[PDB]
Structure formats: C-alpha cells, structure tokens
Design a protein around this ligand. Sequence first.
Ligand SMILES: [N-]=[N+]=Nc1ccc(NCCCCCCN[C@H]2C[C@](O)(CO)[C@@H](O)[C@H](O)[C@H]2O)c([N+](=O)[O-])c1
Ligand SMILES: [Ca+2]
Ligand SMILES: [Ca+2]
Lengths: 84, 854
Amino acid sequence: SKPFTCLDGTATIPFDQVNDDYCDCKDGSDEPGTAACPNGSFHCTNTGYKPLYILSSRVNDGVCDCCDGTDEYNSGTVCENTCR
Amino acid sequence: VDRSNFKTCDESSFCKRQRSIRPGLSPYRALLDTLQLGPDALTVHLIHEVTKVLLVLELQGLQKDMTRIRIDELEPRRPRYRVPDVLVADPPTARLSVSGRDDNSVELTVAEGPYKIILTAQPFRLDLLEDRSLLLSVNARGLMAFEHQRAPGAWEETFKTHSDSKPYGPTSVGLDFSLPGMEHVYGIPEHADSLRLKVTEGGEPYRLYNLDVFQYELNNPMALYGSVPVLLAHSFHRDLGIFWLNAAETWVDISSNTPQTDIRWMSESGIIDVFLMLGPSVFDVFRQYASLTGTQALPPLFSLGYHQSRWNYRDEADVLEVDQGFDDHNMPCDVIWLDIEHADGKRYFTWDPTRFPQPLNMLEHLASKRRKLVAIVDPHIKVDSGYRVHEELRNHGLYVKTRDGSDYEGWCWPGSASYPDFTNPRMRAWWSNMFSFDNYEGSAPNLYVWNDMNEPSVFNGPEVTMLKDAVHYGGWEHRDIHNIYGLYVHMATADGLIQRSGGIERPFVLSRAFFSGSQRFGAVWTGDNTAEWDHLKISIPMCLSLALVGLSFCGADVGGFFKNPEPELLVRWYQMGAYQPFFRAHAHLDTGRREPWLLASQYQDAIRDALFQRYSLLPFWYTLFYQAHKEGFPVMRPLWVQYPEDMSTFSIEDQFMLGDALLIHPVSDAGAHGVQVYLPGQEEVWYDIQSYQKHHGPQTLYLPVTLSSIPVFQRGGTIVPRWMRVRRSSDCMKDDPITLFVALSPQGTAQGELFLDDGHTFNYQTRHEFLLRRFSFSGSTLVSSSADPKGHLETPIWIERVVIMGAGKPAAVVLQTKGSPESRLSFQHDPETSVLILRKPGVSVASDWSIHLR
Ligand SMILES: [N-]=[N+]=Nc1ccc(NCCCCCCN[C@H]2C[C@](O)(CO)[C@@H](O)[C@H](O)[C@H]2O)c([N+](=O)[O-])c1
Ligand SMILES: [Ca+2]
Ligand SMILES: [Ca+2]
C-alpha cells in the first residue's frame, strides 16, 4: 500500500498521516476532514441543497456551517439537517 | 477639554489651605506619657502645640512587612469617615515592643526584627528602618495638617454656579513622607500622564477625584475617571509602596531633593489611614498590597478575546450583520457590545421596543455562533413614574438624598435622573437581584454588563458630578465617599451576574470609575480617548500605571473614541490593542463605521493578522491572569519590574512586558520605517518571534517595520503556550491542542506555566477543577509536571507541536509518557534560524511526560 503526496508537491507522507489531526502539507491537503490545517477546506456534500466548502477552522468548532451538519461530528454540537 | 469647569488646587479651598502650609517645624508633638502598647497596636496621643487639639495615633506593625499609621481626633464632635469594603480582611498584626527610649524618642521593634519604627516626640516624626537602614520618614517636612471638627470658602463655599452648604466646616487631613534614595515614583491613577510621575513643585498637584472630563488632554495632572491612591517608589536598591486609604478628594504633591523624593497627601475629610509597604522587591510590594485589597478577578476566557463595540449598533439586524461580517471576513471576535441607544430612552434594564423587540432571539443567534453580548447599564435612573426601576427605588428610599431629605435629582442621558445610593448595602442587594433572568427581562446567560458614568457623572452638577453635601447611608456626606461610589456599582453589578447563575458563572463587568479594590470586580478602560497618534502612545503608560496598583484588566478604546482614525492609525491601534489586556474597539456616535472589514484589503490583512496573534496567545494571556489572580502580580509590566537594576528602564513607556516572557514595542508613529527596541538584561537573549532571529542583551536594536509589523520578542528561558488553530471565537477554541514555544536561555534552559479550566465557572476554586502545568527544559529534555496537584480537569487538550528556538539538530527525539511505551517523534530543523519543530507529540496536557533530544 502506497503513500500520499500533496497537491502542491510539498513532500509526501504515509497514508496514516491523512486526517490524523496534524498539518503536514503546506497547502493543507492532507487534512480535508479535520481542523488541523490553517489553510484547509472541508467539503459539505449537502444533498438536497448546494454543496459548500468551509474553512478547516470551522470543523468541530461547535457551530453548524453545513446544512447537512457534517462539519460537526465530534464537538458536542449536534446539527440537524436543514438543507430544505 | 474646558478646564474652567474643574477646580485647580487654588479653587479647592481645602487644597489651598493645606498647600499653603510650607515645609518647616511641625507644631505636632507626641505625649509619651499617654503611650500604650495594646494587643493589636500602639496608641499615643498627639497634640497641636498652638491649638491644643488632641489627636490619637494608632501605629501597627503588620504581618508581611507592612506598617499602618492611623490618626483621628481624641474626642471628635462627630465621627470621621473610615473607608469600608475596600480591605478584603482585617490585616493580621505583628507584635510591637519597645527596644529603645529616651526623653524625646521611643524605638519600636516589629516582632523580632529587622524592622524598627522610631517615634520622635517633639516635633512628631516617624522613621521606619530595616536594621540600621532608614527606609522612610513620616512628617519629616513638617507638613502634617489635621483640621479638627469645629463647632457648627472654609464653610459655605461656591464654585461656578454650584453651592456647597459645607455644614461640618473645614475637616481636611494631610501628611508627608520622605523616601531617601528614591528618584522615581509611579502610580496614583488615573492621569493622562507619563508612567514616571513628575514633580509637582511648580504646578498642580496630582488630583484624585473621579470625574467625567470631556475630550481630556494629554500630559497634565487633571483628575480623570478613577482614583487609586497607591504610589510606588523604585531604585536600584529597594522598592516601597504607600497606600493612602481615603475616599475623599485627594491631591498629591511630589518633590525631589543623597537623592530623595517627598510625597504629600492632602484629603478633604475622613481619618489618616496609610499603609507603608516595605518590599524590598517590587513583587514583595505587589504581594503586600494584594493581601490588603485583593487580587485581579479571574476573567472568563471570552472576555480576553476581541470585543467589537460602538455607540451605537442600530438594531438586532445590525448586530447580526456585524456578527456575520466577522465570519464572512475570517476575523475572530468574542463579544459585540450594545451602548445606551439599545434601551428605551436611556431607561436601563429595558430594550427599545422597535429596534430591539426580541432580545432573547438576538442572544440565541449569538449563542449559536458561540459569541457573547455586553449591554450597558448606568447607575443613574430616569425620574419617570412609568419606569418600574425608579418607582421601586423611590418607594424604598434607596436614593441619594439632599439635606432636606428629598431624593437628589440631577441630569444625565435620560434627562432628569436620580442616583441610587450604592454605599447602602440594601441598595447593592437590590441592584444585584435586578440582574436575575426574571427581573432583567430579555437577558440570558451570554449577556454581560458595562457600567459607565459611575463617577457619578451629573451634567448639571459641580465639575460634572454630584454635590459635596448630598447625603448617603448612615448620614455620611458625598464628599466623604466620592471615590468609592463607582466601585460599589461595579461590585453590585458583578455580584448580580454571579447570583443570577446560582453562584456558578464568573462575571464580566467593565467599569469607567474605580478605586482601590476595583481589581476584584472585573475590567476598566481609560474612558473617552481620541483618534490621534499621541492618544495611541499614551495607552501604555496609563495601563502600566493601573497595572502597578493592581488593576491588570486595563485597556483603551481601539481606534480612539472621538473622531475618525486614518487607516494606518487604526491598524497600529489594533496591533497595540492586541497586546494589551482589555481589547475593545469603540467609537463615538458621530464617527464613521469602522468595523475592521470596511478598510482596504492591505489594512484588513494587517488587522486580521493582529487578531490572529491575539487569539493564538489566549492560553498565555489566561495563565498570566491566573497568576495575577493567585499572586497579585501584574499582567502588563514596565521593563523596570523585570530589570530593577537597569536604571535606563525606569522611565520607558513605549515598551512593555507581558509577564516575563514577551517584550512588546508596537509601532506608534505614522509612516515609521523602523523602531528602536531596547532589549535589556546582561547575558540575556531575545528571539524575534516573526524572524526567530536571536539578539543579545543589553542593546538598542533598530528594527525595520512594515504596516504588518508588531515588534514582539520572546525572552530566552521562557516557554509560551499558543493555540495555533485560530477559530471564530474563544468558545470554539477552548478544547483545541496547545503548541509550546521554547526560547532557550544561553544555558540551554527554559520554563513556563499553563493554566486551564472550563473557561467560565468558579469550579476551579469550589471543586479544584483545573490544571496548572509547569514545563521545564534543561540538558536536552523537555518535562511536563504539575505545578499544583490539587488541580484535576477532564479535557481533550493535547500537545500537538513543540517549537524550540535556539537549538541544534538532534539525531533522534524520544517521548516518554506515564502509561505509554517510549515513542519516537519526527522533527524539522532550520539550520539558518536554529529552530526545531517537534511533530505531533500527541500527549494529553493532563499527563506528565518528557521529550529527549539525542
Ligand atoms: N441629557 N442629555 N443631553 C446631552 C446630550 C449630549 C451631550 N454630549 C455628549 C458627550 C460625548 C462623550 C460622552 C461620554 N461617552 C460615555 C457614554 C457613551 O458615549 C454612550 O454611553 C459611551 O460610548 C462612552 O464610552 C462613554 O465614555 C451632553 N453633555 O453635557 O455631554 C448632554
Ligand atoms: Ca496530517
Ligand atoms: Ca462548524
């Protein structure tokens, strides 16, 4: 099983350092699902409305940023789906 | 400012009388036959040789190396005022004994030494000694003056159009103190003046009388909104402090004379009650004073973030647009503020029915962003028979009264208004209960309070405040209590925010007027500054002078209150405000809107960067505030506090320190190309926290700057904790991992602390639910241990990164945690900067651990 690179070409890391809650890529590409990278983005799939991107700092911050609520998965804030 | 509104010393009849007494042989002498050594104190009678008025001197040696001097009349016609509620406790005494004597001298020893007090009988004099070293003298210039209560403008007196019936006649008290070897003094806020106090010999004394001064000017000794009667003397050899416990109008004279500084306090009424705090170090003085008046109240974490305010946000929609603007422009903010226009025609505890019809929904919208709100509540109550607050206070007789017995009525924002008597504890209890969620309708747990105009400001009153002859609880005159009226407001408000929570939630209250002991109740700010470069500059000496006297939670309006700052000025004010304790932008009603995203992107980006630097240092800011809360040590510090023997730091006020780890010299000149940074300390190093460049002290370094520069340096030997994941507010960040910044000393060592709790309750003291971590570096090992084992906390916070400045490349890095196998960590090293970064230690902050560089 192969390792992961980075969309900017700044290095390559083992596959266990993708979404491990530490920032290893200068462009933040290794942490799409966490709040670890300052310049990352989290993708809200948002079925039933427009898909949206939010800042990585708004993942598990306790605030509901996606209408589907998937940005809050381990924060103590439960977001109801509101894409209607 | 219009100076004719405010008395000079000559226009204050008691100031004129006192100041006319010039240095010479005192007519007071001590009757040594009357000497008595009691359980707590020494009492001896004093007599004026010409008038034969009899005074009583109560002399006390105190635990923690302090002396208290109290002088009152022997048989007074009526009682004199003694300041209540400011001392946190009855100060523990130390036994006095007579260790020397002659026909004109009694020498007293405090406990078993080395402190001694010589009481000279004729003329009356006091000398305080450590062993055979003279620390300080009392009445050495012979300036003791004590106007006894004569049998009922020395009496009735007029100023401008205002009349003082003055029923008790001249009653002022004054006393002088001599500081051998001291050439610098600091303290006695609030004045828009330099940190090092100036000699008053050829001009006005410093005035201490809480007053509302419209468009106040710089570098003058006029009294401002708060008064803390504490003066600090510093030399290469010792530190001392004088605490003149008096609540009436007080003037302070300062003269220099081998080097010596003399200090003379002159007060309108009450007794003489002064505390001499003998050090010897400045941190000993901090401790001595803290034991008397208390320590800085631990702020809830959110109040150490960024506050966005102005006079005024228009309606609920405006407030929510401001909230959304921060998030749309990726800028952190914790609190949005609501000035006087949010209420119904300046009737406090109300909401405008059109512009704020659903306050709970507004607060609920802010809670979902995990942000707070502050609403202003002033202590003047509109005289309005439809206003429920006014009807209750009038029906229960809780108002300040006039001599005829009717409730005092003055003028303020709602027009004609009455003033609750906050010196009456029944009134304070009423006020506190008013903040319960049932009484303050529309309030919610994320609504906090701002007390303004609590000098009190009275537009038609003398010097814009209350008449000297208004009457308060117990029959005391307003002239007796003036300077603690605001403190009572701040205290009652703060206790109300605690009570409405059932005693669980910590308060946040900002207050404009203040006194000794105000540090116990929240924050203060320097009132109505102006959008000008010199007002930006003066924020440092003003907050520094408040720091030295216990008020660590200080700030100035970012941007200036009056007028419109130019974009370069606003950026510099943000960078300055981001490194000062209370961090709030505020603005006058007629100024242009200056929310930070309304500027061009270059100014926006520099402002965003300053906000990010602030939010990342919150763990550091929070720890300094915990140390201020436990020890009495100031958060913002003059350089001479950290380098007491470097005489070139004694006057510096374009630079300051945060604890002992960060030295700050913000840019405060338009178009500056550089700054001159004095880095102190023999064999001390400093790290440019932007370039990681190391610099060797002592030196003056020319640092080039751009618009984005905030000149900040970390001291070698310190460890600073940061949250590198900046989010939209502090509530969002308070479970996030910490990064540790280790600046290595020249000996390869460093240390620092970290405090943690839930961020807002009193559980840290009632349940010991907190963490105090000590991080230490030496040899080649970083160790985390507990600095207080009583503290336990359930927290997800972990150590995600360690940044070490001044280190070589290791061959391996090894982590050891109790409960875990020995782990290997990867790292990066820049040979150009000698910066070492340890990747993802992954360890809980509650755990003990060590990292070794091989
Ligand atoms: N009665 N009425 N008649 C009037 C009407 C207007 C007047 N001039 C206003 C003076 C401007 C500066 C005021 C102090 N600003 C306070 C309050 C506040 O401005 C809002 O609470 C805060 O923003 C600020 O922070 C505080 O310092 C006067 N008047 O005699 O000054 C009487
Ligand atoms: Ca990673
Ligand atoms: Ca979120």
